[PDB]
């Protein structure tokens, strides 16, 4: 329900901070996890790689897995008369076969013996599958950069898309400025094809795919009718003197789904193949800044909206609601020891602020181990919450 909550709720969360000022900071991004970066006088940010997809990957080959036959035509000649022929033998849409068959007086020949026969039938694919080769060089990674403000709320994180060919990115964070970052991959395709059957896909070996006993068309083909190896889905029956039957095998979808048992299934959407990527990025924050210095410190009362929550990362989330007047105002907040002499711990949700009165704000803080005082606001009615961190 608030900005930064998603990363707080993740079990795989790294906290990164640079040892220099104005220098680069390295982070590692994986699907399902997030990174929280922090720096002196700079807003805390959350980074998450949310998607890795191949766009318009090149089609290696199209395979026909279901076909129909029409236009069956047969031509045969008498013994000693040579090889018969049909024009259709030139038409790439037809599958043809030359054979020899017994001929004689009973079927128009003056001599008993074997004659040449040829039969053709128009081949029409009714269903095909595709083998694609994804170029690692062009995978597109989507990273979401969320200002860790604890702003309950319209306030969606900054989404950026990059490829390994992209140049340094300058992402703007509304109100904070811009953060610069560069990323590089870290793989799977020199050798695996991605077979797409209807709207599922599978990770398969190159040679296995190229050896499939099915009719095919090279990727470049847009015509899709001059199938190669049509005979793989066709059976020419034994010929008779003047005619011969040709039968097409049935759909091989089921045969494929079966041959695809154990193959790594690849998810996909809108025709694009999705993968789970791995990124290593460097980021610089010299162009970021805190939001709201123009504001002054709240001097109203806050009320802890709910039960203070403990996170999986040694921090706590305190949901407070401003009941005073004078907001947007800065939320007074400090963690100290039992005597309120020294300052202990630190905020993860840096520079907390109330945008609207009675719209509770969530604050993530890191109390020191043991006992401490969470001092929220300033008196009259200053909050003094006892906290024990185990």
């Amino acid at each position: 329900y608030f900005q930064g909550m998603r990363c707080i709720g993740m079990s795989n969360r790294d906290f990164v901070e640079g040892v220099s000022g104005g220098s680069w900071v390295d982070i590692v991004l994986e699907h399902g996890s997030c990174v929280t970066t922090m720096a002196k006088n700079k807003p805390t940010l959350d980074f998450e790689l949310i998607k890795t997809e191949a766009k318009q990957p090149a089609t290696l080959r199209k395979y026909c897995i279901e076909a129909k036959l029409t236009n069956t035509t047969t031509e045969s000649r008498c013994p000693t008369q040579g090889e018969p022929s049909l024009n259709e033998e030139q038409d790439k849409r037809f599958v043809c076969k030359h054979s020899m068959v017994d001929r004689g007086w009973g079927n128009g020949c003056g001599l008993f013996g074997k004659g040449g026969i040829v039969t053709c039938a128009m081949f029409r694919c009714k269903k095909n599958m595709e083998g694609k080769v994804v170029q690692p060089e062009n995978l597109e990674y989507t990273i979401v950069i969320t200002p860790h403000s604890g702003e309950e709320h319209g306030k969606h994180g900054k989404e950026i898309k990059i490829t390994p060919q992209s140049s340094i990115t300058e992402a703007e964070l509304t109100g904070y400025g811009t953060v610069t970052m560069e990323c590089s991959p870290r793989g799977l395709f020199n050798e695996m094809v991605l077979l797409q059957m209807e709207n599922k896909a599978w990770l398969v070996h190159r040679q296995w795919f190229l050896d499939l006993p099915l009719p095919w068309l090279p990727g470049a083909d847009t015509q899709g009718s001059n199938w190669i190896q049509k005979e793989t889905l066709v059976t020419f029956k034994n010929p008779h003197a003047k005619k011969q039957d040709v039968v097409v095998l049935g759909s091989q979808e089921g045969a494929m789904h079966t041959a695809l048992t154990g193959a790594t299934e690849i998810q996909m959407s809108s025709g694009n193949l999705l993968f789970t990527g791995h990124l290593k990025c460097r980021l610089r924050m010299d162009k970021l800044q805190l939001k709201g210095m123009s504001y002054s410190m709240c001097t109203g009362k806050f009320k802890v909206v709910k039960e203070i929550a403990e996170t999986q990362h040694g921090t706590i989330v305190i949901r407070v609601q401003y009941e005073g007047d004078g907001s947007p105002c800065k939320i007074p907040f400090e963690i100290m020891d039992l005597e309120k002499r020294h300052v202990l711990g630190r905020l993860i949700t840096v520079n907390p602020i109330v945008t609207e009165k009675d719209s509770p704000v969530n604050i993530e803080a890191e109390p020191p181990f043991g006992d401490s005082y969470i001092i929220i606001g300033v008196e009259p009615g200053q909050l003094k919450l006892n906290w024990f961190k185990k």
């Binding site: 047969t74 009973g106 079927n107 128009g108 003197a241 003047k242 005619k243």
Partner: protein, 81 residues
């Protein structure tokens, strides 16, 4: 049936209703009678087959289910039911 041509030779397009009847048609050489015994002769559809019915003078037919008595003719029919 519809009488047409295939490379200059007569070509019959036979429909289901003609199963079992002698196919007659005049030709410059006289009246040609072709006999069609195709067991799989069905309705005209995309599943057609096309082949030649040879001229048989004085010989019993053998391994064929279509032949003519005066001029070799091509035949086409569908197999749909």
């Amino acid at each position: 049936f519809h009488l047409t041509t295939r490379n200059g030779e007569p070509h019959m397009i036979v429909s289901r209703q003609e199963k079992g009847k002698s196919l007659l048609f005049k030709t410059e050489d006289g009246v040609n009678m072709c006999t069609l015994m195709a067991m799989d002769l069905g309705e005209l559809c995309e599943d057609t087959i096309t082949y030649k019915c040879p001229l048989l003078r004085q010989n019993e037919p053998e391994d064929i289910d279509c032949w003519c008595n005066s001029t070799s003719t091509w035949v086409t029919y569908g197999t749909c039911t």
